UniProtKB/Swiss-Prot annotation:
Location(s) in or outside the cell: Secreted
Entry's Gene Ontology BP terms: defense response to Gram-positive bacterium
Residues the entry annotates as binding substrate: K7, R10, K41, P42, V43, N44, T45, K66, R85
Name assigned to this protein: Ribonuclease pancreatic
Covered range of the whole protein: 27 to 150 of 150
Keyword Cell membrane recorded: no
Any one of the GO CC terms: extracellular region
Top-rank taxon: Eukaryota
């Protein structure tokens, strides 16, 4: 099975690039990260920062999680991120994604030992 921390890295970490290079980036990454096999993941966010810089968010501003949970943290600074949202004309198994590049604060839920991000709550 996949540990909740390795899963957050596979679905959200992309430190190799500084930001979405083309409008096909989401179609590319959603595919190389295995997020379109049993269905098209309708929404996913990639962060273009170092894994360390994203794990350090677990020691920043503590805020409520979108589900009420109290183990979410908001990054003090804005981070480079890419938003992948399934387009209306997307069809399993041929997923189509709109890619939107942006700089925003990310909010992730942290868990376990050591305290690492285990779920991407949102960005603002």
């Amino acid at each position: 099975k996949e540990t909740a921390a390795a899963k957050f890295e596979r679905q959200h970490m992309d430190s190799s690039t500084s930001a979405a290079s083309s409008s096909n980036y989401c179609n590319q990454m959603m595919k190389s990260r295995n997020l379109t096999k049993d269905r098209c993941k309708p929404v996913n966010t990639f962060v273009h920062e170092s894994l360390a810089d994203v794990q350090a968010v677990c020691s920043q501003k503590n805020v409520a999680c979108k589900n009420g949970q109290t183990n979410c943290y908001q990054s003090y600074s804005t981070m480079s991120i890419t938003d992948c949202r399934e387009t209306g004309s997307s069809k399993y198994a041929n997923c189509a994604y709109k890619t939107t590049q942006a700089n925003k604060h990310i909010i992730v839920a942290c868990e376990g030992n050591p305290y690492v991000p285990v779920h991407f709550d949102a960005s603002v």
